[PDB]
Every structure is written in structure tokens, then in C-alpha cells.
Amino acid sequence: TTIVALKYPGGVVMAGDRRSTQGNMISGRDVRKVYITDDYTATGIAGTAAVAVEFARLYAVELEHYEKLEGVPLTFAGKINRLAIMVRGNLAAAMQGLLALPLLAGYDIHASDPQSAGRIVSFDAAGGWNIEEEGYQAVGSGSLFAKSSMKKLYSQVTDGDSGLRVAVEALYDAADDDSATGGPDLVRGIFPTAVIIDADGAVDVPESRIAELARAIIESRSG
Amino acid sequence: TTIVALKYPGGVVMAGDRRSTQGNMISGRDVRKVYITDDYTATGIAGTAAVAVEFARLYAVELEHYEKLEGVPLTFAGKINRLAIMVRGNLAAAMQGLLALPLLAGYDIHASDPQSAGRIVSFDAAGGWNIEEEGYQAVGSGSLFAKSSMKKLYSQVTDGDSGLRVAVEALYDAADDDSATGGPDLVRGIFPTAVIIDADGAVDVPESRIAELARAIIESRSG
Amino acid sequence: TTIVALKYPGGVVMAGDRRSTQGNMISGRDVRKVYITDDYTATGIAGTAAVAVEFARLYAVELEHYEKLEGVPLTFAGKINRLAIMVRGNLAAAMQGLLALPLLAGYDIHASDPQSAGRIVSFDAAGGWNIEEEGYQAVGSGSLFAKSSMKKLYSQVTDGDSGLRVAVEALYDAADDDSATGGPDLVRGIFPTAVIIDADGAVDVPESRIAELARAIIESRSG
Amino acid sequence: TTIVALKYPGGVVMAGDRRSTQGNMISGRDVRKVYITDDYTATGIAGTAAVAVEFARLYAVELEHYEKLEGVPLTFAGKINRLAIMVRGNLAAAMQGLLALPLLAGYDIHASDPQSAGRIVSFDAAGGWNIEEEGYQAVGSGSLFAKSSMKKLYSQVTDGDSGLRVAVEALYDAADDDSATGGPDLVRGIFPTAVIIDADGAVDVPESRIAELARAIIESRSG
Amino acid sequence: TTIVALKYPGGVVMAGDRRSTQGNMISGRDVRKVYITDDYTATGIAGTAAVAVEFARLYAVELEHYEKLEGVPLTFAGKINRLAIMVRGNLAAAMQGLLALPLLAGYDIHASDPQSAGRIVSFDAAGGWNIEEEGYQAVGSGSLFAKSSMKKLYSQVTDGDSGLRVAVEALYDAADDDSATGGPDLVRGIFPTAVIIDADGAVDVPESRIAELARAIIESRSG
Amino acid sequence: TTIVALKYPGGVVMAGDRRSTQGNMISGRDVRKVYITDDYTATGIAGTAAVAVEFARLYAVELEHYEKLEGVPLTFAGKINRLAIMVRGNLAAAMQGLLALPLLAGYDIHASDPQSAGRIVSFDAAGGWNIEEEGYQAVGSGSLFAKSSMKKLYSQVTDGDSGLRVAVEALYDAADDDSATGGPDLVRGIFPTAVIIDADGAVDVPESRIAELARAIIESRS
Amino acid sequence: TTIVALKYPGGVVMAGDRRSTQGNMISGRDVRKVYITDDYTATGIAGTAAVAVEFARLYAVELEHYEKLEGVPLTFAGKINRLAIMVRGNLAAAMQGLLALPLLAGYDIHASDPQSAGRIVSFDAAGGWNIEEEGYQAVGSGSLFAKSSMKKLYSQVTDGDSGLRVAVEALYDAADDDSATGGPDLVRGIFPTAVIIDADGAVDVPESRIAELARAIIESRSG
Ligand SMILES: CCN(CC)C(=O)C[C@H](NC(=O)CCc1ccccc1)C(=O)N[C@@H](C)C(=O)NCc1cccc2ccccc12
Numbered sequence A, B, C, D, E, G: 001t002t003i004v005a006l007k008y009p010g011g012v013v014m015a016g017d018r019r020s021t022q023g024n025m026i027s028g029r030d031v032r033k034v035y036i037t038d039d040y041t042a043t044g045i046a047g048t049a050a051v052a053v054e055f056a057r058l059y060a061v062e063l064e065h066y067e068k069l070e071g072v073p074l075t076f077a078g079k080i081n082r083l084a085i086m087v088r089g090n091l092a093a094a095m096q097g098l099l100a101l102p103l104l105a106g107y108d109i110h111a112s113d114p115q116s117a118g119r120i121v122s123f124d125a126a127g128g129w130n131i132e133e134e135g136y137q138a139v140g141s142g143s144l145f146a147k148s149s150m151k152k153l154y155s156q157v158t159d160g161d162s163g164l165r166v167a168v169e170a171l172y173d174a175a176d177d178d179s180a181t182g183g184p185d186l187v188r189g190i191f192p193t194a195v196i197i198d199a200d201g202a203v204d205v206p207e208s209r210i211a212e213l214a215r216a217i218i219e220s221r222s223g
Numbered sequence F: 001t002t003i004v005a006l007k008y009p010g011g012v013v014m015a016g017d018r019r020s021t022q023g024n025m026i027s028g029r030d031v032r033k034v035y036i037t038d039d040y041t042a043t044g045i046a047g048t049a050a051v052a053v054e055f056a057r058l059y060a061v062e063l064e065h066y067e068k069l070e071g072v073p074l075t076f077a078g079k080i081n082r083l084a085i086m087v088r089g090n091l092a093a094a095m096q097g098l099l100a101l102p103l104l105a106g107y108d109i110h111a112s113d114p115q116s117a118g119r120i121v122s123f124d125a126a127g128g129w130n131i132e133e134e135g136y137q138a139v140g141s142g143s144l145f146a147k148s149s150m151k152k153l154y155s156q157v158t159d160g161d162s163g164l165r166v167a168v169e170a171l172y173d174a175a176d177d178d179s180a181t182g183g184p185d186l187v188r189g190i191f192p193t194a195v196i197i198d199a200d201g202a203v204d205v206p207e208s209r210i211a212e213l214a215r216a217i218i219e220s221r222s
């Protein structure tokens, strides 16, 4: 698994690979690991499938629950705190093998500067979290390759589109060096999933855009 | 890892993928797992790289050693016994993690029928061996997938070319369902290695032939 | 054990073998592993017999329970979720040996496209689920052999009859390569169980048609 | 695995199934487990393949070695003792999992009565042996099914041919109730191996005769 | 211990031996292991004596309890389910050595065809149950000898008498090959217990009839 | 520890950091992990210090031993084999925790094409080796960061100088993301060590040039 | 991690590094480890991030909770006790790896002598506490090095500013000899965090001040 997220001027982007394994065996090619959890938040998760989907689902339900009870959505800090509490709650099972870590990408509507209002928060198995002030982050078995790639490509991020390309390319490098992360399947037409978040909300990036970027990167490395 | 071997009228074919892993990380893209061990036999090995290479090298040396000492090469059965004894010798280390299993493909010059002179022999970690009378065999983490693919495609084997095609395609399905097995890397131009053996001896199949077969299988599954 | 399920135009088909073992001993020849759980759903289960049957029975009761309490059946997603939760509840006992995995086949009455309204969902020991968009799926000790067979035979599926034949042939390959999966017993007249589900509901396929198909497969493979 | 042996008037017969497994997976369909160890003796071995084949090979070499050194073959008692000593020698490795048990069938050329000159000897993991004066014996995972079948069918043994039928049928029942023992494959034309031993020596029973008897049994149990 | 049960046209028969052991020592010669649990059902149990007798006693009590509470006896399926739940309830204690498995024989008065209304249900330590469609079944340390005997004698079962004799003979073979199963004691006048169940109900077969069959079997095996 | 090696037209370069640790404590700031083992080969080692230095020392001794006994140096393949056999020999102690892996960089004088005669060989704890046809390789706790950095910077390698810079920068990224890899110490004046190998042989890169390259990278990222 | 605290005439200062690790990998460069817990107390914590942040936040909440409930802040002894209790409460999780130790720096408004009203309290994993009468203290993986540095530099503490310089220099030495403690990053402009506390309350030391002191130290150690 590899989940990546990076800040661009005025928003944030998150993308994830599509491969699911049981040990060395490929058990899935079309899985979705990045979920829109509310109008301004997306979550990408690495780890045990059952636990990850449970995280995404339960979290979305909790956030909208607070919003309907109290007539107002949680502050972003509050959203972070609830996700962390959820992870910490799973710690016991995580130590026996049902481990899953989330990566949080959001747009803080109450932030002062709407152009840096994007937020990227990483978590550990104990619920400890860090808000990434360096602009990008990744989680999963390919997260080191992806981060080290973005370290070189991040200066090319000037808007949402260029940031989306850097995200897809980081996933490409991850899948290149990690067998548990899936690269683009040009035969089946399966590409990474992406979510883009700005002041207008969180939207799924359409498949075709990611496919165009994928073919562009592949060509770039061939000739 | 996936190593395949199949009999065709008048010869035998063996092919292997090019991937090396350490856990989930890709540690090699160009490795060689199929070795010509003598003029009429090739060995492909799965398992720990160091032990596999030592097997191939030491075995080739042993065969040519006997051939120079006694002026005549071993009967094929004798070659079988030697590889088996070598494998059994390693059992202790195999238990401690240095496990490697070979697959032997040969052409028996002393066979009655020059068309069924192909031989495929499989081994286990304790040296037990079986001569495959069903025409094909595979070993490695993707070997089950390769075998099940060849079970369906084997009726199409009529000459060296079709047999080589079925072999490469079995490797394709294997890499398709196993992350530890590498498929064709069309970007870097890295394809499986193949060895073909007939009455004229054992030759390495050039990479361009396999490249053509790979592209053929791909656009065969694309439409 | 092997259970297979595949989508065909306008419906879904699921079939399961009939063998029960205790270690190497054959303890059953006539076992039924595919259960109609409601008017539009069948469940086939692999694993400990007690746990498998208990799953099927309790699941059917739960679905129809909701249907009578609320005057309407669950949406298909709801059926998936309840099965997953049931599996997850058993995780503790499964870790001690009472392990069972189900495979879900259903027809979604609320789907827009009647042709693709078939649904096949697979589960793992932790309740994680996947809706298979590639058309077929299997579970059990022979599941990899069956999946790899259907990978080659699936293009021949155009109706319920051809799909049922591909299913039975997949079970044949599974039982061919798996000692824990039982093939057709022509001496005793015992054949796999099959369930077909379309807009008209879920019905048991009559044993005679499965017999016909089994003999067709056998005869095509002997000459 | 199942090996059977029975005494008939004027000779002895031994037969073995053809299946090789790794756990539940069928890893071989054609293996030979019954070996002619000298002009008047055959050995069939059950257990791990490496140790079984090693037993057969080494034993045959030992017997013929004594015969060429001393110009005369061992008494049957001597053959028994040497096989026993070999098993006891392997006891340590067997206790570590490399376990194999043989079954000995011979014709004692020095017996007074040529009708009761048949000999059937069974062994345990510590080398203890028993000469079976009840006429039949079996070894392997299906040996209890085979023994109990012969307990009912033994009265039908009147010559080498009927004894061969009873042997093949006992193997049939063994394969019927034990998944680790393989029955006759009428699709592939693979049947158990048999060796018959009388005053003229030990000879392999031709494939076609066993095939005939197998179909006789099958059509006998169907109608 | 050995308990056998078989279906005959219009009824069912169950019989059990009389031996009780502590390790190798004979601790009982006249014990009863087959109990009439209700007007149309008998249960025979193998395993720890305290647990077996408690199963039989509590089970009969449960059946008659339901009958008196609801004015009607349980359907046979219900009887199965309650016995299964009882076994599963004992599972934990079973894995500490207090293990007992039952074998259920009944006559389903609500079946459509009165001549095939016989029912034989076997259970495992986890409560999994199977209704035996092949006509006979056994449980205990001698159960495999008994089953393999009935496999040969079952074609002779045409009525209650032939079914009874076949059962008693199966117990004879079980006791012949199993030291934990007791054969007929002609010195003490102690023979297996048997229950016959048809449309008129379940009755204990008198000792005289069983002794008669025992002597018949012995002289059949002597001459 | 992080050791990097990369091929450039007509040669090869290898560089390694200077940090030695015991757990979290820094126990050394100036160590040398890249050694010239013969006129045309250098070896850099990661792992337990004792095993690493013993590897380098015994390896150099073995090569020169064969050269003096037989009047000719080992073929490059032979050098590979001897280093591999040494690692395999250490496997047992390595399993007790005394693990060290080498990285081999050489110039093959018997090579067909003098431009592409550079060679880079990596090893695992069992003596398995791989000759890298992709131009660069690294070993140690920061080797993932260094490899992934070179994956982006390698297209900039056109001569010995650009290759040396790329190596030093990969070490910079490695030390940036790995606490067990030491970056340039501008206060104490301690920089990575580097060895360059071409047809004229293997020579130590002088400290001054690495210091310059480091300060250029630093000023470039600030 | 390294947290230092030292008393100066009329106040106290506490400072902490900014590095976060996962084993050898640096997972953070800007983390905050020193928290102002109330107007007159700051807490810095070393260990697992989740537990440390939870300690700081929960502690601040508890103190202000008492202040609002009872209209008056806790005595310093009370503050110390509550923190001590909080740690002892975490002891169980600490035994399993979720270990965190705090270091408390405060200004006792009720102290008799205002120029020595600074207080420094250290804690162990069981909640045992000690008030440091020697003027300075440290906690974390670099605390030995920082303490031994302050042991030499403490005579230079004459006002708040000299105390701040000595604190920063101790952190510098700690990061110099410990890889788990991060020094000043002049490229990214990230420096230790510092809090100063006197009678006017607890205030965060501005980053520019610490940067000045850091660069001064570096220049002093280079030339
Ligand atoms: C979707 C469920 N299926 C098919 C039935 C799988 O095969 C998933 C696989 N389960 C397992 O490997 C089973 C783990 C387990 C639990 C209890 C006892 C023993 C073993 C998995 O989680 N693999 C992990 C390593 C993984 O791939 N994780 C990647 C991942 C991340 C976020 C969302 C995802 C959604 C679906 C699938 C994967 C997802």
C-alpha cells in the first residue's frame, strides 16, 4: 500500500494505489484506499483491509453525527483528535496483527490564509499525530520511496494540476520499488485513486485525468 | 520467483522471471534464475539467491568434472541423483532459512525416441525427486498460477515456438497473480530468461524473441 | 473445500464441492456447502463444518428477521455488512481453529442494469470484504486452482448454461489439484451443488444438469 | 500413500498407488512406490519421498552386493534383518520428520512348500518387523482401509491373477476413503503399480492388466 | 469403544460394545453405551464415560421436556440441533480430555416415505453434524474397522434382521482389530447392546437374539 | 551508515559518511567506511565496525596475496566471488548480531568497453551478490533515501565531477532522513570520504573538493 | 529527545529539542515537546509522542479544571501530586512500551523568597518525584549529556538571559552526542523550543531569540 498527500496553493491532494495482497499473493486490483470522510476531509489508510474500511466508515459517521447533533461541524483540530482517539482505541488489536494507520488530508475552512489552509496529518499505531509543515507525506509499505521522490519533485508544485502529477508520480516510484504497491495497469485500465480538496470541498479526481498523467510519466521514462 | 519448464516435440523449454525481493522491497530487476548447467541440461532455482546460485554453479562444475575425469558425461538419471544429493546436503541450512529448490530440464541423448527425449525433474527440500510425465512443471511462489495456466494452454504446444510462447505466458499469469514474480518491464526492456534444449544442445533464447512474445501476450489481453 | 461463483448475463451462479475430511480421511461424500440464504442470495462457506453451517443458518435467519420486522429486505450493501460483522465476531474462535470463510453471491433487485445485477463478494477472516468486479471468485483449499481455471474459461460465458458449465469445470480443476476438494463421483452419482440467481430468484440447479455437464467435461478431457 | 501385499497359492503380489501430496495439494500423479529389490523381492515404501526412494535404492544395492561378494544370495531372514537395521538406522531422522516405513514382499526359494513360500513382512519406525502369516498386509495412510477390505476379499484369492484383482481393489478402497492415496485415473490412464513374485522371480505386472482390472472394479460398483 | 448404526428398509439399527477401560486396564465388562433417548430415537456415545452418560441422560430429558411443554415432540431436525448444541457446549471441557462424541439414530415419523424414514446423524467435537446418506456410520476407536466392514456387508441388508446381523458383525470386526472395543464374551454371557427403531418405535433387542447372531458369526469365522 | 556508489562515463565513484553509533549515542564522528582494496577496486562496508574493518583488511590482504602468489591479479569476477565467500563465512556470527554488508566498486581493466567498464556489486548477509546494471547503488541504514535521491539526480551524471557531486548529495539526503547517517559537520570540518576509480586506478578524493561540494549543496537548499 | 530546565534568579526556564524518530528514521523536525500547562507551570515530556501529548493536554485541563471549580489554583505541591498520579496511572501501559516521563518547571507564587521561587520536579515511571535542589535537570535520551554540560555551565547563570543561553547550549551538547536529539537546523530555521517563567507568568521564548543564541554557540564552537 502507498498513500500520498501533498499541499498545493489553495488546497490539498491525496492519492493511493489499488493493489491488495494476502502475503505475496495479489488478492485485489481495484480496491479504494482513499475516502472522502466529509466535505473538507479525505482519509487514506494502510494496513488490514477490514480495519481500514472500518476506520473510514466509522469516522465519516462520527463527524457527520457531531454536525447533526450540534448544528456545526467540528473544528479541524477536533477532527484530528477524534481520528487519533479511534486509532488509539484499535491499538490492542493492532498489536495482535489488525494494524491500520491513516493519513488525513483536509482543508481548514477557519484557517486565516485560504491558500495554505490545506492540512496533512499523519498518525502512528498509538494515535500520536503530526501536522506536516513540510507540505507532503505518505504512509504504507512504499511510503519511503514516495516521500523521497516527492522530496525531489515538490518544487514543481505550483497549482492543483501540477500537484496531482507529483502525487501520481510519487505513487509510481513507490510501486516501482515496492511489490506491495500497485502501479498503473494499462491492460486493465486501473489507476491510482485521487481526491482533491480546496475551498469548494472534496472531490474525486476523475479516472481519465489520472490515466493521462500515468501515461505521461511512463512515456517520460521510456522515450 | 517463478520457474517454468515444458516439453515440446523434440525438445524442452525453461523460463524464469527477473525479480529479486527482500520482504516487500524490490531488490533486483535483472537477475538470472535459469542457468545452462551442461550442454543438455538447464537448472532454474527458486529460493534464497545465494544458495540458488551456489547450486547452479556447483552443479555445473560437478557434471563437467565427471565428464573430464571419466571421458563421458553422466547418464541423465545420474545427473538427477547428483542434484538430489546436493539438495539433500543443504537440508540443515534449508531449515534455518537458506532454502532453495531447483527445477531440472534436460534432453536425454540416450532416449529411444528423439522426440520424447525431453525431461523435466522436480525436487523438494529433502532431495526427493519426480520426473514429470505430464509435460510441464513450475516452482516458486507463482508456480501454482503458472501450472494452472499451462494446464489450459498446453494443448497448443506443437513445436519449439509455441512451447516457448506457452512458457512465457505462464510466467505472465504467474507475475500477474504473485507480487514476488516479475512480469515484463516494457519501460526498461527487461524480460524473462529462457533456455531451449533439443538434440543440437541447449541455447539461451535471446531477449528480443521473448520481448516479441511478451508484447504479443499483452496486446492479446488488451483487444 | 472449493466454492466458486461467477456472474453471467442477467444473473449469478455459485457451486460447491461435496467432500468433507478429517485430516486425510474422507469423512463425507455428499456434503452441501452452498446455501440459499434468501430469495435473492446464496452463501457458500469453507472451513470447519460446525462454524460454516452455523454461519449459513444464522445469516438466513438474520436477513429474513429484518425483512419481517421492517417490511422490506435489506439493501444488498446491508446484507454484505451483516455477513462481514458476523465473520468478524468469530475472529477469536477462528484463531483457535474454528475458522470459516463465506463467499456471497446475490442479485441486487435495486440495480439499474439488469444484465450486471449479479454480485459476488469475498471475505477474509477479519471480515474485510471485496465486491469482485472481474466476474468470478472462489474460496477454499482449491480456490486458487479454480480461479486460475476460470481466468482462462470465463470468456466462454454467455448465459446461465455456459456459466454453470464453466463453474463446474472450475470445480473439476480444483478437485483435480486439491485432495481436500471432491470431484464428481460417477460411481455414486454425487455431483457438486449449484445455485442460480436471476430476477426470478434463487433456485437450486437440478442434480441431473450438473451430472450432464460433468460427463461432458470428463469426455472432453479423455479424448 | 497405500501399499498392499498378499500371499497367493504359489506366489506373492504387491501393489501401490501413484499419488504424491504436499499437504492437501496433489504434487504428483505418476510416482512409483513399489520397487523390485532383487530377483525374488519387492519393497514398497510410504512416507517422505526422499527417504522412501533412498530406502529402496540402498536396500537393492545391499542385497545384490552381498550376492556378488559371496556368490550366493542372502536367506530371506537375512534380507529381513538388513531392512530392519536400515529402518532402525533412520529412526533419528524419522523422529525429526523424515519418516518412511517399508513393506517387504518376497518368495523364499529355500522354503519346502512352493505354495506357502510367499512372505509378507511389515516394519515399524524402530525396525521391529512381523512376518504376516494371515496372508496380507498394507502400509501407508490408507493401510487400515486396505487391510479391512482385504479381510473381506481375501477368500477370493486363488491364483496370482485373482490376488492381483484383490490387491488393486484394496487399493481402490484405500483411495476411496483416504485423500492422500490416489485411485485409478481413467482420464489420464494412470493406475497403481504391481509386482508379482513366484518361483520364476519377480516381474512388474503390465499396465494394461491393472487397467482392465480397475475398470472391472469400477463398472462392478456402478452397474 | 465402537458404536455402529445402519439404515434398513423401513427402519434403523444401532449397536454398541460393552467394554470400559482406564488406559490398558479393563474397568468394565457390561456397560451400556447405546441409549433409547425417546420413543423414536436412540443415541450411542463414545468417549469419557461420565460425559457420555450425562449427554444421553440430559438429552433424553431435554426431548421429553419439550414434548411435555409443547404437547408435541420436536421435529427430527430439531432433535439434531439440540444434540449438536449440547456437544458444542461441551467443546471446552473436551479439549481438556472430557471428550464425548454421539451417534444419533432415529425414525422420522414425519417423513414422506416411511420405508426410507430411517436417519443416522454423526457429530464432531465442535457440534458439526452430518445426516448420513450412505446408509451406515460408526464412532469410537474401532469405528474405522467397523465402517470398512459395513462397506462390504451392507449390500446384504434387506430388512431388520439382516441389518442387525451386519451391525453385530461390524462390532465383531471392530473388537477383532481394536483392543479398546470388547467382543462377545461367551464365558460371561456378555454381548453388545442393540436398539431397533421403526414406525412402531424404538426397542432394545433382547440379549438372546444378539447372542444368537454372535455365535453365528463366530462359527462362520471358524469352520 | 550510508555508502553510495555510482558509475560515470569512464569510471566509478564511491562515498561514505563518517558517523559511528552505539544505539542512539554518537560514538564516532570521523570514521572511514570506504577503503581502497586494490589499485582498481574500493569497498565500503555497513554494519558492526569490527566486522566491517576486518572485511576490508582481510579482503585487501587476500587480493594482494593471490596477486603475489600467481603473478597476476584476480579477474573481477573472482574478486566478487572472494568477497561473497567471505560474507557467507561470516553468516553465523551475523545471525548472532555481528552483521556487516559490503558494497564493491571497481574498474574492470579486462572489460570490452573502457567507457562502461565501471562495476558496482552489492551483497547480502548470505554472500549473494548482484551486479547493478542501473548505474548506482547504496548500502546502510540510509541507503533507501540515497537510492531514491539518485533515482532523480542520476540523469545529471556526465563526468567525474558531476558524479562525485551526485554521490555527495545522495549522502546528504541520507543523513537528512536517517539519524544513523552523519551529514557534513561544518563546525568540525568533517565531510564524507570518497574514492574515484578510472583507467588510471583508484584514488582518494581529496577532502577540499568534497567540502566545497557539500557547501554548494547546503547553500543550494537554503 | 532532550528536555532541560534550570532555575535562574527569580525564575525558571525549560527548553526542548524538535526531533521525532521511529527507530533510526527521523519522522519529525518541528515537534513541540515543552508545553505551558498553566500561567505558572510548564511541562516537557520525553517518550512516546501519543502519551507525552496526552499527558500535557490532560494535565493542563486538570489544573484549570480545579481552578474553575474551586475559584483558586492548586498549591504547587498539589500540582506535583496530580502529575505524579497521572504518571503512576500510566505505569501499566508504560510496561508494554507506551512510556513517557515528564519534567515539570514552575514558579511558586506562594513561595517565601521570590528570587528562588523557581521549582523543578522530575518523575519516574512509577510516579516517584523529586524536587531538584541543585538548580537544573533534564529528561530524555540526551539528558545525561545535557546534565553534565549544565553541571559545568550553571555558574554562568545570573539572570533569565544567561539561563536561556545555558539551556540552549545544553541542548546543543545533547544533540551533539545523541542522534535521537535534534540540534539547530540552520537550513530549515528550526530551533529548540523554550519557555520562561517568572512572577509575571509563563511565556514562550520567541524563536528569533533562540536562533540568535544558537548561531552564537555554533560560531563559538567553530571560530
Ligand atoms: C478486502 C478483503 N480481502 C479480500 C477478501 C483481502 O484479501 C484483504 C487482506 N486480508 C488479509 O490479509 C487477512 C488478514 C487476517 C485477519 C485475521 C486473521 C488472519 C488474517 C488484507 O487486508 N491485505 C492488506 C495487506 C492490504 O492489502 N491492505 C490495503 C488496503 C488499504 C485500504 C483499504 C483496502 C480495501 C480493500 C483491500 C485492501 C485495502
Ligand SMILES: CCN(CC)C(=O)C[C@H](NC(=O)CCc1ccccc1)C(=O)N[C@@H](C)C(=O)NCc1cccc2ccccc12
Residues within 6 Å of the ligand: B001, B019, B020, B021, B022, B023, B027, B028, B031, B032, B033, B045, B046, B047, B048, B049, B050, B052, B053, B097, F122, F123, F124, F125, F126, F128, F129, F130
Ligand atoms: C542478489 C542478492 N540480493 C542483493 C544483494 C538480494 O537482495 C537477494 C535476497 N537476499 C535476501 O533475502 C537475504 C536474506 C538473509 C539470508 C541469510 C541471513 C539473513 C538474511 C534474496 O535472496 N531474495 C529471494 C527472495 C529471491 O529474490 N530469490 C530469487 C532468485 C532465484 C534464483 C537466482 C537469483 C539470483 C539473484 C537474485 C534472486 C534470485
Ligand SMILES: CCN(CC)C(=O)C[C@H](NC(=O)CCc1ccccc1)C(=O)N[C@@H](C)C(=O)NCc1cccc2ccccc12
Residues within 6 Å of the ligand: C001, C019, C020, C021, C022, C023, C027, C028, C031, C032, C033, C045, C046, C047, C048, C049, C050, C052, C053, E091, E122, E123, E124, E125, E126, E128, E129, E130
Ligand atoms: C459434519 C461433521 N463431520 C462428521 C462427524 C466431519 O467430519 C466434519 C469435520 N470436523 C472436524 O474435523 C472436527 C474439528 C474439531 C472440532 C472441535 C475440536 C477439535 C477439532 C470438518 O469440519 N472438516 C472440515 C475440514 C470440512 O470438511 N469442511 C467442509 C465443509 C464446508 C461447509 C459445510 C460443511 C458441512 C458438513 C461437512 C463439511 C463442510
Ligand SMILES: CCN(CC)C(=O)C[C@H](NC(=O)CCc1ccccc1)C(=O)N[C@@H](C)C(=O)NCc1cccc2ccccc12
Residues within 6 Å of the ligand: B122, B123, B124, B125, B126, B128, B129, B130, D001, D019, D020, D021, D022, D023, D027, D028, D031, D032, D033, D045, D046, D047, D048, D049, D050, D052, D053
Ligand atoms: C517427489 C518429490 N516431490 C515433488 C517436488 C514431492 O512433492 C514429494 C513430497 N515432499 C515433501 O513434501 C517435502 C518434505 C519436506 C522436507 C524437508 C522440509 C520440509 C518438508 C512428499 O514426500 N510427499 C509425501 C506425502 C508422499 O507423497 N509420499 C509418497 C511416496 C512414497 C514412495 C515413493 C514416492 C516417490 C515420489 C513421490 C512420493 C512417494
Ligand SMILES: CCN(CC)C(=O)C[C@H](NC(=O)CCc1ccccc1)C(=O)N[C@@H](C)C(=O)NCc1cccc2ccccc12
Residues within 6 Å of the ligand: E001, E019, E020, E021, E022, E023, E027, E028, E031, E032, E033, E045, E046, E047, E048, E049, E050, E052, E053, E097
Ligand atoms: C465410569 C466407569 N468407570 C469406572 C469408575 C471407568 O473407569 C471408566 C473410565 N473413566 C476414566 O478413565 C476416568 C478419566 C478421567 C476423569 C477425570 C479427570 C481425568 C481423567 C473411562 O472413561 N473409560 C472410557 C475410555 C470408556 O470406556 N468409554 C466408553 C463408554 C461410553 C459410553 C458409556 C460408558 C459407561 C461406562 C463406561 C464406559 C462408557
Ligand SMILES: CCN(CC)C(=O)C[C@H](NC(=O)CCc1ccccc1)C(=O)N[C@@H](C)C(=O)NCc1cccc2ccccc12
Residues within 6 Å of the ligand: F001, F019, F020, F021, F022, F023, F027, F028, F031, F032, F033, F045, F046, F047, F048, F049, F050, F052, F053
Ligand atoms: C569500534 C568503534 N566504536 C568505538 C569503540 C564503536 O563504539 C562502534 C560500535 N560498536 C558496537 O556497537 C558494539 C557491538 C557489540 C558486539 C558484541 C556484543 C555487543 C555489542 C558499532 O559497531 N556501531 C555500528 C552501528 C556502526 O557505527 N557502524 C559504522 C561503521 C561502518 C564501517 C566501518 C566503521 C569503522 C569504525 C566505526 C564504525 C564503522
Ligand SMILES: CCN(CC)C(=O)C[C@H](NC(=O)CCc1ccccc1)C(=O)N[C@@H](C)C(=O)NCc1cccc2ccccc12
Residues within 6 Å of the ligand: A122, A123, A124, A125, A126, A128, A129, A130, G001, G019, G020, G021, G022, G023, G027, G028, G031, G032, G033, G045, G046, G047, G048, G049, G050, G052, G053
Ligand atoms: C508524532 C507522531 N508520529 C508521526 C507518525 C511519530 O512518528 C511518533 C513516533 N511514534 C512511534 O514511535 C510509535 C511507537 C509504537 C506505538 C504503538 C505500537 C507500536 C509502536 C514516536 O513517538 N517517536 C518517539 C521516539 C519520539 O520521537 N518522541 C519525542 C516526542 C516527545 C514529546 C512530544 C512529541 C510529539 C510529537 C513527536 C514526538 C514527541
